[PDB]
């Protein structure tokens, strides 16, 4: 202890008698043992071994490439229909959206429908009484913010959702606020500092969701400029 004591020890006495020969022989046998591990290591270990070996091959290829290589529009027009980026999305059945819920001791009444997918309810939601509610939009499947990307600027932002204007499946779903793929939403954009001609600040814009958030907790979307 107290400092680099083994470095001192190696300076004073020195490593072993049988250290350099054995290291040379390990480096020599590694060529055999690499192939031995390839023809062996059944399963996940062999898969990972192959992945590592492929990545190592690519690294050395790029290194040698770097070695051997190290040995009309203007600037402003470079870098440059009204169709949304997702028309014709997969169609959702009413069965795949609504789950049946049964009420009573002997459960015999169903009349209740739970929406299985992620939802946007609003700002003043305030659940209905149980005897009067039929549509159930559970609290975990309730989104307030989305992950909206501007195609330009290569930038994304975690913006608060303002509304749902168009879910392409059965405009009932728009009023329920179902955020399925291809759904069009109004999001706030005051964080970006956008302003129209006249000096009026823009604080709302349309965006289209690109993912199926029933499979991912994320609601990812693309701005419609």
């Amino acid at each position: 202890p107290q400092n680099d004591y083994i470095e001192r020890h190696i300076k004073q006495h020195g490593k072993r008698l049988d250290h350099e020969e054995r290291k040379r022989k390990r480096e020599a046998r590694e060529s055999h043992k690499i192939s031995e591990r390839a023809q062996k290591l059944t399963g996940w270990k062999g898969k990972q071994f192959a992945k590592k070996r492929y990545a190592e091959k690519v690294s050395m290829r790029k290194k040698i490439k770097a070695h051997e290589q190290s040995k009309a529009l203007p600037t402003y027009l470079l870098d440059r229909k009204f169709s949304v980026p997702l028309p014709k999305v997969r169609g959702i059945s009413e069965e795949e959206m609504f789950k049946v819920i049964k009420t009573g001791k002997s459960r015999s009444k169903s009349w209740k429908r739970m929406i299985t997918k992620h939802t946007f309810v609003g700002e003043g939601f305030t659940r209905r009484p149980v005897k009067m509610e039929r549509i159930i939009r559970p609290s975990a499947l309730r989104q307030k913010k989305a992950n909206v990307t501007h195609p330009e600027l290569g930038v994304t932002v975690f913006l608060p959702i303002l509304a749902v204007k168009k879910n392409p499946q059965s405009p009932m779903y728009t009023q329920l606020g179902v955020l399925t793929k291809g759904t069009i939403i109004e999001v706030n954009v005051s964080e970006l500092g956008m302003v129209t001609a006249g000096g009026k600040v823009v604080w709302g814009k349309y965006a289209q969701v690109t993912n199926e958030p029933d499979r991912d907790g994320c609601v990812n979307a693309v701005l419609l400029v």
Binding site: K99, T116, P138, L141, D214, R215, D216, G217
Partner: protein
């Protein structure tokens, strides 16, 4: 849940085992500051503390998994949770090398 618990066990072993560079003694504090750059030290340990996020991901995705209506949906949610954990840890490459 097991994947979350593993990461937070590991991170807790880092946080509790390492000393608090403040709160020790001024001599040891100043010595370890001139050795390890107190700012870098505290910043790395704060990065690990805030990553210990993983709990949030586990809780959120479990509570989402309660409503899974199919094997594919549940599988994709599991994959999503573990992938976000992996992203968080991938963003911890340099502090662990320092530590």
């Amino acid at each position: 849940k097991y994947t979350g618990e593993g990461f937070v066990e590991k991170f807790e072993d880092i946080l509790k085992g390492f000393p608090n560079i403040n709160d020790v003694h001024p001599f040891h504090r100043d010595l370890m500051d001139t050795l390890y750059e107190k700012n870098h030290y505290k910043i790395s340990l704060a990065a690990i503390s805030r990553a210990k996020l993983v709990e949030q991901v586990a809780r959120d995705y479990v509570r989402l998994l309660k409503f899974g209506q199919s094997l594919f949906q549940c599988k994709q949610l599991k994959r999503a949770a573990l992938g976000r954990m992996a992203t968080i840890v991938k963003k911890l490459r340099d502090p662990l090398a320092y530590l």
